[PDB]
Scaffold this active site. Structure first.
Site, PDB file in Angstrom:
ATOM      1  N   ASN A   1       0.763  -1.244   0.000  1.00 16.79           N
ATOM      2  CA  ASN A   1       0.000   0.000   0.000  1.00 16.79           C
ATOM      3  C   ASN A   1       0.792   1.291   0.000  1.00 16.79           C
ATOM      4  O   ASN A   1       0.258   2.363   0.264  1.00 16.79           O
ATOM      5  CB  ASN A   1      -0.984  -0.017   1.153  1.00 16.79           C
ATOM      6  CG  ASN A   1      -1.932  -1.192   1.065  1.00 16.79           C
ATOM      7  OD1 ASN A   1      -1.905  -2.088   1.916  1.00 16.79           O
ATOM      8  ND2 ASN A   1      -2.770  -1.212   0.016  1.00 16.79           N
TER       9      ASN A   1
ATOM     10  N   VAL B   1       1.685   6.900   0.565  1.00 14.00           N
ATOM     11  CA  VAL B   1       0.869   5.911   1.235  1.00 14.00           C
ATOM     12  C   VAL B   1      -0.526   6.031   0.669  1.00 14.00           C
ATOM     13  O   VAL B   1      -1.062   7.131   0.560  1.00 14.00           O
ATOM     14  CB  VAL B   1       0.795   6.148   2.737  1.00 14.00           C
ATOM     15  CG1 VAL B   1       0.027   5.010   3.389  1.00 14.00           C
ATOM     16  CG2 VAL B   1       2.187   6.262   3.311  1.00 14.00           C
ATOM     17  N   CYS B   2      -1.108   4.901   0.300  1.00  7.51           N
ATOM     18  CA  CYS B   2      -2.442   4.903  -0.263  1.00  7.51           C
ATOM     19  C   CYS B   2      -3.382   4.013   0.516  1.00  7.51           C
ATOM     20  O   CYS B   2      -3.412   2.801   0.314  1.00  7.51           O
ATOM     21  CB  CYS B   2      -2.384   4.454  -1.720  1.00  7.51           C
ATOM     22  SG  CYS B   2      -1.290   5.492  -2.747  1.00  7.51           S
ATOM     23  N   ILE B   3      -4.149   4.629   1.410  1.00  9.11           N
ATOM     24  CA  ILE B   3      -5.123   3.908   2.232  1.00  9.11           C
ATOM     25  C   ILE B   3      -6.470   4.646   2.232  1.00  9.11           C
ATOM     26  O   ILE B   3      -6.515   5.856   2.012  1.00  9.11           O
ATOM     27  CB  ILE B   3      -4.593   3.735   3.666  1.00  9.11           C
ATOM     28  CG1 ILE B   3      -4.254   5.110   4.266  1.00  9.11           C
ATOM     29  CG2 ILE B   3      -3.383   2.798   3.643  1.00  9.11           C
ATOM     30  CD1 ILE B   3      -3.702   5.064   5.667  1.00  9.11           C
TER      31      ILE B   3
ATOM     32  N   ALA C   1      -1.340  -0.118  -4.306  1.00 10.32           N
ATOM     33  CA  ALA C   1      -0.677   0.983  -5.001  1.00 10.32           C
ATOM     34  C   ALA C   1       0.679   0.506  -5.470  1.00 10.32           C
ATOM     35  O   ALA C   1       1.395   1.209  -6.182  1.00 10.32           O
ATOM     36  CB  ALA C   1      -0.513   2.170  -4.070  1.00 10.32           C
TER      37      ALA C   1
END
Length: 152
Positions: A77, A84-86, A123
């Site tokens: 992620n 950071v992709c959350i 990601a």
């Protein structure tokens, strides 16, 4: 806005989310945070000292900040650019970003990300693919990131 961040940053520094150190890149700009993220225990990221930067919009409460990891890290992620992709950073339910959320909320969901990655459109596929099948080399690469974070 600038009032809420000053308050949140202050609590953060007095009572941090265990394993997180927050400060300002520029002391006269409360919108750019430098945060030390120590790898949580019982996760491949254990002795990691991963540096990261939080960018807060001018209208923070109702608009998620962007979190970019500085310091090499190998995670499903976190893209190849450290971004950071959350969900909780996403922003047009409780999954996405809410105006009642705090830096604390973000930091907490980050321990989760490191402890339990969410694939579903990672990601970073290279990583997503790796941990799933070639678990062998994956742990070996996380270790490379942890060994490097301890010498920088």
């Amino acid at each position: 806005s600038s009032l809420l961040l000053k308050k949140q940053l202050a609590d953060m520094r007095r009572v941090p989310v265990d394993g997180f150190s927050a400060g300002l890149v520029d002391d006269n700009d409360i919108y750019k945070w430098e945060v030390l993220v120590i790898g949580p225990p019982d996760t491949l990221y254990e002795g990691g000292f991963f540096k990261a930067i939080l960018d807060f919009p001018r209208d923070y409460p109702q608009k998620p900040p962007k979190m970019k990891f500085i310091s090499e890290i190998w995670h499903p992620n976190i893209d190849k650019e450290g971004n950071v992709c959350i969900s909780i950073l996403h922003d047009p339910p409780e999954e996405r970003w809410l105006p009642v959320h705090t830096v604390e909320t973000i930091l907490l969901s980050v321990i989760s990300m490191l402890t339990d990655p969410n694939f579903e459109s990672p990601a970073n596929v290279d990583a997503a693919k790796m941990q799933r099948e070639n678990y062998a080399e994956f742990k070996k690469k996380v270790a490379q990131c942890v060994r490097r974070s301890q010498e920088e």
